[PDB]
Amino acid sequence: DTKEQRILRYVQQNAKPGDPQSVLEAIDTYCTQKEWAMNVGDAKGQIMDAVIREYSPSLVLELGAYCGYSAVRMARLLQPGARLLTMEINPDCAAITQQMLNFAGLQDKVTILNGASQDLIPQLKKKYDVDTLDMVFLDHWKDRYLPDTLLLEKCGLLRKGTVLLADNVIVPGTPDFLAYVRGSSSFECTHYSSYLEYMKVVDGLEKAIYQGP
Ligand SMILES: Cc1ncnc2c1ncn2[C@@H]1O[C@H](/C=C/CNC(=O)c2cc(-c3ccc(F)cc3)cc(O)c2O)C[C@H]1O
Ligand SMILES: [Cl-]
Numbered sequence: 001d002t003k004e005q006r007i008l009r010y011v012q013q014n015a016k017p018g019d020p021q022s023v024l025e026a027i028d029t030y031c032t033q034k035e036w037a038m039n040v041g042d043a044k045g046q047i048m049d050a051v052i053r054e055y056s057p058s059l060v061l062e063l064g065a066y067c068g069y070s071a072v073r074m075a076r077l078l079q080p081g082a083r084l085l086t087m088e089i090n091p092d093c094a095a096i097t098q099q100m101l102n103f104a105g106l107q108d109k110v111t112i113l114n115g116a117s118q119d120l121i122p123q124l125k126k127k128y129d130v131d132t133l134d135m136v137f138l139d140h141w142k143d144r145y146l147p148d149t150l151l152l153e154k155c156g157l158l159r160k161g162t163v164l165l166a167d168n169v170i171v172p173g174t175p176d177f178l179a180y181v182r183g184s185s186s187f188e189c190t191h192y193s194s195y196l197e198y199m200k201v202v203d204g205l206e207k208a209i210y211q212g213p
């Protein structure tokens with residue numbers, strides 16, 4: 001088995017079904033005590049929670065589910081009727097994420113799309129009946145943040161006021177994306193300093209609010 005499967009099993013052996021907080025705590029405990037993994041973690045997760053509560057988005061897109069930790073984090077704070085779409089290229093991770101959400105009781109709020117973001121993004125309008133996104137959480141391969149931001153715009157999926165929230169803008173970093181949004185008159189940017197998941201290493205989230213063309 002894989003580390004990802006081991007995290008899911010620990011949740012199944014240690015958390016309460018239908019209790020998102022107990023799922024998050026179990027993941028954090030496993031990744032602190034047993035094996036590190038690239039979940040967004042509790043430090044940055046608390047910032048994410050405060051941003052999601054502030055904006056109360058009706059439709060969120062996540063790029064890069066991994067094991068579903070961030071999807072559980074976000075979905076548990078969505079207002080009734082609001083929804084999350086999460087894209088995950090690795091079929092094993094897509095299935096783990098679906099199972100994590102099922103365990104947490106959040107499955108009716110989330111759609112887990114198994115595929116590459118650059119292939120799925122152009123299908124959101126026609127196949128998934130999306131108009132525009134209220135929020136986008138970027139947490140996939142770091143060289144894809146900028147290409148996918150540009151693709152989202154091309155596809156008409158951003159509106160004035162869409163909130164981009166990007167993980168890992170310090171470590172590993174996403175230098176092209178970060179320079180681009182910070183230099184662009186089409187984004188208003190704010191940096192939230194924090195810590196790499198499960199580590200005493202500085203990281204941060206970037207909030208980049210789209211201003212329109
Ligand atoms: C194109 C595309 N479409 C859909 N899913 C995609 C995708 N590219 C990746 N994915 C999925 O996102 C996930 C991957 C994300 C990449 N994230 C990382 O590489 C990552 C790495 C670190 C890190 C920090 C310090 C260190 F010393 C070592 C590592 C920390 C993090 O928080 C991360 O998100 C899983 C993958 O299948
Ligand atoms: Cl995560």
Ligand SMILES: [Cl-]
Nearest residue numbers: 089116117118
């Ligand atoms: Cl790819």
Ligand SMILES: [Cl-]
Nearest residue numbers: 041042043198
């Ligand atoms: Cl943490």
Ligand SMILES: [Mg+2]
Nearest residue numbers: 040139167168
């Ligand atoms: Mg990350």
